[PDB]
Structure 1
Amino acid sequence: NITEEFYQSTCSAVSKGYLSALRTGWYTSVITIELSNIKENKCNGTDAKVKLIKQELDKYKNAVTELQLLMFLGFLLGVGSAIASGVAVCKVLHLEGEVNKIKSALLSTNKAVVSLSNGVSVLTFKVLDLKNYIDKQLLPILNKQSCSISNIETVIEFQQKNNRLLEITREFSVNAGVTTPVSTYMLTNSELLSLINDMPITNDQKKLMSNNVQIVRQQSYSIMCIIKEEVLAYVVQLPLYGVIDTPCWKLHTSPLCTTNTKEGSNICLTRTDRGWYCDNAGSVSFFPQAETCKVQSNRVFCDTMNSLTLPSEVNLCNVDIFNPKYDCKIMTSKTDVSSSVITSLGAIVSCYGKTKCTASNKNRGIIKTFSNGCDYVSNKGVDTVSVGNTLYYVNKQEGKSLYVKGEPIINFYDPLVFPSDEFDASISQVNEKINQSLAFIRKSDEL
């Protein structure tokens, strides 16, 4: 199911066999909580039971009032406006009579599809009806028995209904009205599964979102919207996955240096194009910041806004870094430091200088001692790896790894002309800079 190749020639490794789930767009949904504005609580505070509902009722009013008061290579990626879509939906909701459409469509059911004034149709959802609870069940009970409640179960039932509205207020109050991930107080699990199931999307998409709701939360926003008339409404902005089931691979890179004994005589080179790569629509979406992608089993959830769009020929850097069809990215240094990069199925170890680097087994201890240079170890017989004072645990996911033998590419560069401070360079950039610096030495010799 999952495979990995280590390229000793360039001190890097590729894990393949992953499937894609790229967030490509947004669905905006309108979630409503119906509230009731209560005029005068002209009750007494003598009976113990009345005090609790009266104080619980004061708690509610403050929450309603409080909400009204509220109204490498990563640097290439570019800038988006993460919630411009949902906020756009929110701005439409402030228009005259647009709130009434929502409220009347949710008069008989708790879920409805509404056509907005600008023409876009958006799923609607009444998730909590506190107005009706107060107006028809609590306030009538209260007045009848001379403003006192003779049943402790009545106060608790209200504290439970009110509790969610209070916890929603706490979240918008600490997040300035835009939260992520969408909490279970904003959208309960059943509501989110109902939203996905009622969304205008593929059955492949619905199944994906429904089996991975936890990931759907993490990629979702809750945008607090309006409190007008008798309804509080907030927009839940859900990710729709327009690219699914395409091959994905992760590139891991580590520094590749010479191994001379002279302290500073060494030269280094590292591939900068580390991150996730997924095929989608004939090109390759590249995700440099690999921490923004989430892996579930073998599915990679990435966001195209944190991606570059690359030609399919990018994969050629894995077959031959000196190909003329794509100029592979590298950085160059003279900093021969030891480190390790843990991959999907093993460990890359860049062991240089006098640093002690070993690979250990849980039942045997140290089972390999690395020599200077860049090496790799499969996760089969190995459980941990130590480079200096740092112990790394290796991933224990099962899968075949293959060690691709090769002469280290750093040996093909001459130390006298090597540019050792290039962060955003390439094979072709360093080649022509050697030619330019090596030819400058020819002009003096022909002299």
Structure 2
Amino acid sequence: QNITEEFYQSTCSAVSKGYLSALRTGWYTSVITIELSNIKENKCNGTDAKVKLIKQELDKYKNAVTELQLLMQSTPATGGSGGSGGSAIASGVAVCKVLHLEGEVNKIKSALLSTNKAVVSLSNGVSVLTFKVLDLKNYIDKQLLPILNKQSCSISNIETVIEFQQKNNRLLEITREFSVNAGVTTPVSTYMLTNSELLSLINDMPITNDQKKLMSNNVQIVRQQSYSIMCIIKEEVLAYVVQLPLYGVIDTPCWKLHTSPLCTTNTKEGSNICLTRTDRGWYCDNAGSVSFFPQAETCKVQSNRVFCDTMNSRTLPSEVNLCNVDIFNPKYDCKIMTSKTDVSSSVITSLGAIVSCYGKTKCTASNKNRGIIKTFSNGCDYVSNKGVDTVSVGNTLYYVNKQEGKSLYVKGEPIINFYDPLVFPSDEFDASISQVNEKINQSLAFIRKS
């Protein structure tokens, strides 16, 4: 919706509010089928130039079928070591394992006899929406076979060769993508499922009309957060599972936390201590708690809405937001790391830029027609994106976002000035406020008595 931003001068951090959530909590498994033809290379004294082209494409069709056949034994055998990869495709893997039953292929075979798509109830109680997106069996048996399976193969047609190359192309590219990916691809490509097929797949999913609108206006993100698992190739059918994300958390407030090192600015470069707020990234309200995503690369932002996968998240108490308003609060122990690294750096936020300027570094903010409009002093500062297009830190040039929104500069004393440098734990990798004050109380006790 409307994006706001608050910069906290005391902790060298900023929070971008106003975002809406779209967190994946479920999966929908669809069975995409390709009707195939099994045939044998028949001896024929092929002498017609159109015959040689058909023979070459039939070999490419058979080679694909053969590779897939090898791959059918590997896709259930791949993995098993555990981890995040196996847990992400377990819903689809469970469907692939059911399609290995004798009954099961026939059942989707019978449901797709009259229609291209139909809902099938599998033996494991999973109701899947089955698609038939390519019918190579009917094309090979109706056009290629009568033209080929006579004693004189010289009969042919030039438009039949071009059309067969057109239809067979998708099978070769689906084979190619499944070949180098051991049967599990992500994102789901157009060869794996076209946009018209995906939009038709979304419209028939057992989801609300609001979720149909959401997934149809964010197809690119839906494809990225989806998996395609190769299942089987038996009985004249090629079947693979397309695993679509289900967003069980929608329209809850999200916010992104930006952090930058906060150091003292003494002239003596060796007497400077630093601290940095940890756990930067996306936060979203979720089921009375907060879903925290440490790797912001796992979330996708599309028009002020944040698409994330819950498997890449940590569940934190709602009191974690207190670190943005009062980092010394006792409800939640806010985490910081310490250093003596007085190296300048910048962080482009949603509506501005944080600048940690230290040493002799030249840190400015410029407008391309007006020039330098702000010069950052030693320490941690912030500039809005209004009237600014460039931030320069040292030899590197950053560009601010030109998005609309209000920024609030929350003035405050930098908390690094509250610590005695002679007693400050300078190299804490993953500490907290109470942790640092605990060590400081330990060291201040030995000196006070002796």
With normalisation by structure 1, the TM-score equals: 0.95
Which shows bigger deviation, 308-317 or 342-351?
Answer: 308-317
- Could you tell me how far 1:41 is from its partner in structure 2? 2.8
Which shows bigger deviation, 211-220 or 200-209?
Answer: 200-209
Residue 366 of structure 1 corresponds to 372
Residue 309 of structure 2 corresponds to 303
- Could you tell me how far 1:204 is from its partner in structure 2? 1.4
Distance in 2 separating the partners of 1:41 and 1:385: 71
CA contact (8 A) 1:44 1:50 kept: no
- Aligned to 2:50, the other structure's residue is in SS state helix
- Could you tell me how far 1:142 is from its partner in structure 2? 3.7
CA deviations 1:369-398 (Å, max 9, x no partner) are: 111000001111110111111111111111
* Residues 1:118 and 1:18: Cα distance change in structure 2 (over 3 Å): same
Extract unaligned runs of 5+ from structure 1.
72-77
Distance in 1 separating the partners of 2:151 and 2:447: 103
Distance in 2 separating the partners of 1:93 and 1:7: 56
CA deviations 1:138-188 (Å, max 9, x no partner) are: 212344693234431111011101011011111111111110000000000
CA deviations 1:52-73 (Å, max 9, x no partner) are: 11111111111111111223xx
Distance in 2 separating the partners of 1:109 and 1:266: 73
Identity of aligned residues (%): 99
Residue 81 of structure 2 corresponds to none
CA deviations 1:340-390 (Å, max 9, x no partner) are: 011001110000011111111111222211110000011111101111111
Which shows bigger deviation, 129-138 or 269-278?
Answer: 129-138
- Could you tell me how far 1:222 is from its partner in structure 2? 0.5
- Could you tell me how far 1:103 is from its partner in structure 2? 1.0
- Aligned to 1:251, the other structure's residue is in SS state strand
CA deviations 1:97-155 (Å, max 9, x no partner) are: 21111111111111111111121211111111101111123212344693234431111
CA contact (8 A) 2:143 2:160 kept: no
CA contact (8 A) 1:36 1:135 kept: yes
CA contact (8 A) 1:130 1:162 kept: yes
Distance in 2 separating the partners of 1:9 and 1:352: 16
CA contact (8 A) 1:345 1:398 kept: yes
* Residues 1:372 and 1:249: Cα distance change in structure 2 (over 3 Å): same
CA contact (8 A) 2:366 2:374 kept: yes
CA contact (8 A) 1:35 1:231 kept: yes
Distance in 2 separating the partners of 1:296 and 1:367: 31
Distance in 2 separating the partners of 1:177 and 1:122: 20
CA contact (8 A) 1:32 1:126 kept: yes
- Could you tell me how far 1:39 is from its partner in structure 2? 1.8
Residue 269, structure 1, aligned to residue 270, structure 2 = no
Distance in 1 separating the partners of 2:423 and 2:130: 66
- Could you tell me how far 1:38 is from its partner in structure 2? 0.7
Which shows bigger deviation, 147-156 or 57-66?
Answer: 147-156
CA contact (8 A) 2:230 2:239 kept: yes
CA contact (8 A) 1:253 1:270 kept: yes
CA contact (8 A) 2:26 2:246 kept: yes
CA deviations 1:383-415 (Å, max 9, x no partner) are: 011111111111111111111111111111111
Residue 182 of structure 2 corresponds to 176
Residue 207 of structure 1 corresponds to 213
Distance in 1 separating the partners of 2:240 and 2:104: 14
Distance in 1 separating the partners of 2:162 and 2:149: 18
Which of the numbers 292, 317, 320 marks the counterpart of 2:326?
A: 320
Which of the numbers 122, 136, 142 marks the counterpart of 1:130?
A: 136
Distance in 2 separating the partners of 1:338 and 1:18: 29
CA deviations 1:76-103 (Å, max 9, x no partner) are: xx88722122112111211222111111
- Aligned to 2:252, the other structure's residue is in SS state strand
Distance in 2 separating the partners of 1:408 and 1:41: 83
* Residues 1:314 and 1:80: Cα distance change in structure 2 (over 3 Å): farther
CA contact (8 A) 2:274 2:426 kept: yes
* Residues 1:340 and 1:80: Cα distance change in structure 2 (over 3 Å): farther
- Aligned to 2:308, the other structure's residue is in SS state strand
Distance in 2 separating the partners of 1:47 and 1:364: 74
- Aligned to 2:270, the other structure's residue is in SS state coil
CA contact (8 A) 2:37 2:236 kept: yes
Distance in 2 separating the partners of 1:57 and 1:148: 16
- Aligned to 2:143, the other structure's residue is in SS state helix
With normalisation by structure 2, the TM-score equals: 0.95
- Aligned to 1:80, the other structure's residue is in SS state helix
CA contact (8 A) 1:20 1:248 kept: yes
CA-based RMSD of the aligned residues comes to 1.4
Count of residue pairs the alignment pairs up: 438
Which shows bigger deviation, 412-421 or 79-88?
Answer: 79-88
- Could you tell me how far 1:440 is from its partner in structure 2? 2.3
Distance in 2 separating the partners of 1:443 and 1:102: 82
CA contact (8 A) 2:51 2:156 kept: no
